[PDB]
Amino acid sequence: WRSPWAISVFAFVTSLLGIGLLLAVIHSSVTRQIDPKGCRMSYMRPSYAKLSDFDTEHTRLASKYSLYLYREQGIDHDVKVRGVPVLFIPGNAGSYKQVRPIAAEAANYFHDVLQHDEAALRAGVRSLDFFTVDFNEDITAFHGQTLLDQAEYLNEAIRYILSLYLDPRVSERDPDLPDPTSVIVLGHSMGGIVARTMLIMPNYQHNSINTIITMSAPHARPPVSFDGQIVQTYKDINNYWRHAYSQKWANDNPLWHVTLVSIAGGGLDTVVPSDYASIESLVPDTHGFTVFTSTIPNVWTSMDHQAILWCDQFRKVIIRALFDIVDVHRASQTKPRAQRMRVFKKWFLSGMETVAEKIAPTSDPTTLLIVDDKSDSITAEGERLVLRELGTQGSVRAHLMPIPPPGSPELKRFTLLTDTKLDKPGENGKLEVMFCSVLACTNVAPDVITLPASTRFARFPFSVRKEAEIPPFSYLEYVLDDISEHQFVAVIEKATIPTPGFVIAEFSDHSNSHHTRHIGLRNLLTFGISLRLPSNRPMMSEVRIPSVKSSLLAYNLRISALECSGRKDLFAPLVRQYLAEPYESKYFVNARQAAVSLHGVAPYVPPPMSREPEAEGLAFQLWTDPTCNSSIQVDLTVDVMGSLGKLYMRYRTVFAAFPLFIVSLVLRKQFQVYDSTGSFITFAEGLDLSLRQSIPVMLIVLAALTLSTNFHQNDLLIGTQDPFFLFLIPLIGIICVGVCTVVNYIALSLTRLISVVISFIGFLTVRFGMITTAVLLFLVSTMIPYQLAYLVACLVQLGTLVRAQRISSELRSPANSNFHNYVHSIFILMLWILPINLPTLVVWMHNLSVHWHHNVFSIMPFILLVETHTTGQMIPRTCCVLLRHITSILLLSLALYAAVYGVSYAYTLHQFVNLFAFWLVMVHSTA
Ligand SMILES: CCCCCCCC/C=C/CCCCCCCC(=O)O[C@H](COC(=O)CCCCCCCCCCCCCCC)COP(=O)(O)OC[C@H](N)C(=O)O
Ligand SMILES: CCCCCCCC/C=C\CCCCCCCC(=O)O[C@H](COC(=O)CCCCCCCCCCCCCCC)COP(=O)(O)OC[C@H](N)C(=O)O
Ligand SMILES: CC(C)CCC[C@@H](C)[C@H]1CC[C@H]2[C@@H]3CC=C4C[C@@H](OC(=O)CCC(=O)O)CC[C@]4(C)[C@H]3CC[C@]12C
Ligand SMILES: CC(C)CCC[C@@H](C)[C@H]1CC[C@H]2[C@@H]3CC=C4C[C@@H](OC(=O)CCC(=O)O)CC[C@]4(C)[C@H]3CC[C@]12C
Ligand SMILES: CC(C)CCC[C@@H](C)[C@H]1CC[C@H]2[C@@H]3CC=C4C[C@@H](OC(=O)CCC(=O)O)CC[C@]4(C)[C@H]3CC[C@]12C
């Protein structure tokens, strides 16, 4: 007799190391390598007007959903549309009220700044009208039908909206303005998936949507694979986007005038891996980009799932970008696609990305410099301009630096960096940088890169108190080949009183300023990297480590002091960590120590298609005072504990199905021991025996399968075919031996607790004092979602397990120990399909509040086995070798299938365990 409670020293240590690593991964993911939170709360006056003219006549889903139009209180006094239509699709468990901050800032900007502008009104800027959908806090990620129903409802609403702009009592707008044929769709979370689904739906108007701006939307892969329909919808929307853009002829492309910008909140986003927000595999760079929120200028901060919609810093950047893509003189109320893309690139991207277009070199001359005929400001070639303060000469004066000749073999770059705002043409301010050919001068202001302000008192690139926001530094950068036509670069001081300021401008050879360190990941993970930048270094220097591409490894960056002899630094050192492929850039103001966590190659997303030739891996860009005549040292080491929590977000769904592979192997061992020796061993005796051979060999075979134009290559197993991460198979295997052991002990404790309560109550009433199985089966077969029928079965198998345990304690017979063991093993298998089947219960219950074959074949095999155990029968021991073989093969196939296809096709695991349960029913029927 072995108590069901006993554990072997080998299986306890293996189980505790697994529970110990799951507590380390979770802790190091909540505490280590965490980004700073610079999000500032947004304050607004909210009002929503229900558009109830839309009804069951326009869609049968109108009884279920509603459409509301945001009206900011004090700026909006009628439910009348005067501007361009914008729809916010809320995400999973999201409200229509989450549109509160974005709509409010758009209302307050037109009221305070734009209505007064006559050029902006003339060119076609009108207010934006923000419509929002109440999806009754539906959970789209777990029910595929709900996502499709929402897309159909919104395609109708886009038709009903555009119809309110043709109506005089609900429209108040000018009459030369074409009637709107497009709505701008902003989707948070799964609302960016509902937005793309609409374009593939049968009820979609041809040119209804042109611009989709999604916040934290998982475009690459489904967050959860519990629902099959979600897995197929993604395969249809993802395929539609990739086949459309594959088309050579733009006429064939149905998505030519469409633009998708996928914004992501980065690390602080725990609900959706920001790696799944990447559109690189679906949209060409011409038609969209994925930008993290750390690269966005005027934000420079990672945001949590909800913070993306409620930040004050982010609410300002999206409303400014939208009011620069809108034209009421065009049917679709938007600028053409290539213009829409440049506006999104200037407002959301840094400017140092290589997709940006500098327009000022070839821009027409804007100024007439005649005060440079006198030869007083021209300076020596190779002479770097440094203006420690401005206007010490008491007059508007100039400092003119010659553009070197095009004969340069190396690449050479002009870089200017001034804290002071450069002036735009037609304005007067302290500084004006212009490329002047001899006389004709083009202001370079349109091309200014705003960098966070690194000053000795700065800790963060973002400030959560608006009063303390250090005005951003201006930066200019230009490859010489582009600026060669112009002869000089003139920094004109227009200041006339001594004033705080700094302009350091210099032309640097690319070699001297650019460094690449080629060290293997294995060498960098053992020795780190140290790089001394020489004292005679260009103001901007750029180290690139091509090896660091993974999102699973985190490093620490320690930059040396840069103490200056004599005078102090004009600015503190600024580091920009960045990746080319997913537009994730990070800025460390006044760098000393920095945590390098990057969103690079990611476990299960489509393969990165950039195949960039030289720009790959991680690069840090360092800006320091170049007049300090002192060297700086750069150190990059690996963070072992912080890198382990990087695993928690990427594999926070492999515990739905990988813990099933362990159960199948243990059950297989139990069944083969039973058939050979006639004793059905306990789940803990099955783990010790299985952990000695079958769990190790099957973990070695899954590693072998990994090492053995298709965008679904990374969907199986651990998601990566890189030989470096094969260690993830044992970490995912040993965390499961621990979770699959605890669950065994929890089930045993639950059985014991229920037994003692039934005893206590029997004591309570004793001293002081078949039909149900048939009814439940009838109810379970008839009229309920099969997922609830599975949950009641699991409750009837707990009843059999309690009635088996009590008989086993009272008799202590060999065969009564056989049944308690077998029922526990079957109940333990069933408890592991609940993770995949429990979510459809939540949707059914909450959608029934609003009054809203497969249903039989899927639960009957399990309804029969739970009933053939309420009769006390033990599986007949198992033509004999062939029968025991089928049992084994069927339980080994389940283990292998649950490891390979359980992250992407987890829903199928319910229908594989059904097959096994039917096999058990047939084996029961044999004897
Ligand atoms: C032995 C087998 C297992 C036992 C039975 C099964 C128990 C659990 C099974 C799993 C399936 C059901 C639960 C699914 C999780 C739902 C997550 C969720 O809805 O929540 C997000 C976000 O919440 C999270 O990130 C979850 C973190 C805690 C997870 C705890 C899970 C429990 C696991 C431990 C179980 C231990 C069991 C051992 C034995 C008992 C909120 O979306 P939100 O940000 O609001 O809206 C988006 C946004 N505003 C927008 O607008 O779009
Ligand atoms: C194999 C390698 C990869 C797999 C291993 C790990 C994958 C995960 C596997 C399974 C999922 C585990 C279920 C949920 C865990 C994660 C919860 C979590 O991280 O969600 C926090 C909340 O975290 C907590 O508050 C801790 C509680 C977690 C569970 C602790 C017990 C675990 C029980 C396990 C059983 C042990 C029993 C053994 C007995 C000895 C929400 O994001 P939060 O940080 O609060 O946001 C703050 C904000 N955004 C911010 O900016 O900082
Ligand atoms: C249910 C929750 C608390 C999950 C955590 C489970 C384990 C981490 C702990 C709690 C239950 C414990 C077990 C409960 C009962 C037993 C059997 C007990 O001895 C027996 O009754 C069997 C006879 C024998 O040991 O030879 C020895 C300790 C042990 C293995 C305990 C070892 C430590 C265990 C596995
Ligand atoms: C501990 C043992 C018994 C098993 C572990 C349970 C897992 C099945 C749970 C634990 C953590 C859960 C995850 C925690 C949070 C999320 C985010 C959330 O993602 C969504 O699909 C909705 C978010 C959105 O897209 O808006 C809900 C599913 C998911 C992946 C959960 C799926 C189910 C998981 C993997
Ligand atoms: C919410 C989670 C933690 C589940 C725990 C609650 C249920 C699973 C409980 C509620 C009622 C219980 C049932 C109430 C009565 C019985 C009869 C009992 O057997 C008898 O009829 C008496 C004979 C005997 O106990 O020896 C076996 C357990 C069972 C099915 C119980 C199994 C556990 C049940 C379903």
Author numbering: 139 to 576, 604 to 873, 895 to 955, 980 to 1062, 1069 to 1094, 1102 to 1150
What does the literature reporting this entry say, word for word?
In our quest to find stable proteins suitable for biochemical and structural studies, we identified PGAP1 from Chaetomium thermophilum (cPGAP1), which shares 20.7%/29.1% sequence identity and 33.8%/45.7% similarity with the human/yeast deacylase, respectively. Due to its higher model completeness (81% of its 1183 residues), the cPGAP1S327A structure is used here for structural description. cPGAP1 contains a transmembrane domain (TMD), a lipase domain with a typical α-β-α hydrolase architecture, and a third domain with two jelly-roll subdomains that show a classic β-sandwich fold. The lipase domain of cPGAP1 exhibits a typical α/β hydrolase fold, with an eight-stranded β-sheet sandwiched by α-helices.
To obtain the cPGAP1 structure in a lipid environment, we purified the full-length cPGAP1 with a C-terminal TGP fusion in detergents and reconstituted it into lipid nanodiscs made of the membrane scaffold protein (MSP) 1E3 (average diameter of 12 nm)50 and 1-palmitoyl-2-oleoyl-phosphatidylserine (POPS). cPGAP1 co-eluted with MSP with a monodisperse and symmetric peak on gel filtration, indicating successful reconstitution. Using single-particle cryo-electron microscopy (cryo-EM), we determined the structure of cPGAP1 at a nominal resolution of 2.83-Å (cPGAP1apo). Superposing cPGAP1H433N onto cPGAPapo positions the PLM carboxylic acid close to the catalytic Ser327, which forms the catalytic triad with the nearby His443 and Asp407. The three structures are overall similar, with a Cα RMSD (root-mean-square deviation) of 0.04 Å between the two product-bound structures and 0.38 Å between cPGAP1apo and the liganded structures.
